Amino acid sequence: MNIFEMLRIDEGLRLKIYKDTEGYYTIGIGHLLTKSPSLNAAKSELDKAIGRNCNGVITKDEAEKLFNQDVDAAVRGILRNAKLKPVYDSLDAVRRCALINMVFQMGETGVAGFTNSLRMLQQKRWDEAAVNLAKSRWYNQTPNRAKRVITTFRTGAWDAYKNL
């Protein structure tokens, strides 16, 4: 298991413009297009992102291209972030993937807001951090995914994703 496989279990693959759990316009492997309510604004963002006239629909290939960019940017954003970098550096390879997953779903900013849990993960207090992470909008809104990520931080192994 690796970051790509993990995220693709959590996000899925859809070749047609669709709405987020949040109601937002997305395509591919969780690539958010716009937070705007117009299908039209989304279509335009889509064509700008791919470099063609897509008419709301992309190929597998195009989806995976978007996915590679998104992953790269998530990692780079962590490395560039003063609050995230030190936690990332402190973690083992598997746990690193759990932080990358949160960033991908919620953005640098959103994760950098989990101050207390970041602190606990740095200290390697795994059980405490897992209880703290659960007390969030994130967990309440997408509990099955949050719980997979959470077990990943708790255990340091890929078991939550074995089932799936």
UniProtKB/Swiss-Prot annotation:
Variant or mutagenesis effect after changing E11Q: Complete loss of activity
InterPro entries membership: Endolysin_T4_type (IPR034690), Glyco_hydro_24 (IPR002196), Lysozyme-like_dom_sf (IPR023346), Lysozyme_dom_sf (IPR023347), Phage_lysozyme-like (IPR052619), T4-type_lysozyme (IPR001165)
Gene Ontology molecular function terms on file: lysozyme activity
Name used for this protein in its record: Endolysin
Active site: E11, D20
Variant or mutagenesis effect after changing T26E: Complete loss of activity at neutral pH; covalently bound substrate
Effect on the protein of changing T26H: Facilitates transglycosylation more effectively than hydrolysis; covalently bound substrate
Compartmental location: Host cytoplasm
Keyword entries, A-Z: Antimicrobial, Bacteriolytic enzyme, Cytolysis, Glycosidase, Host cell lysis by virus, Host cytoplasm, Hydrolase, Viral release from host cell
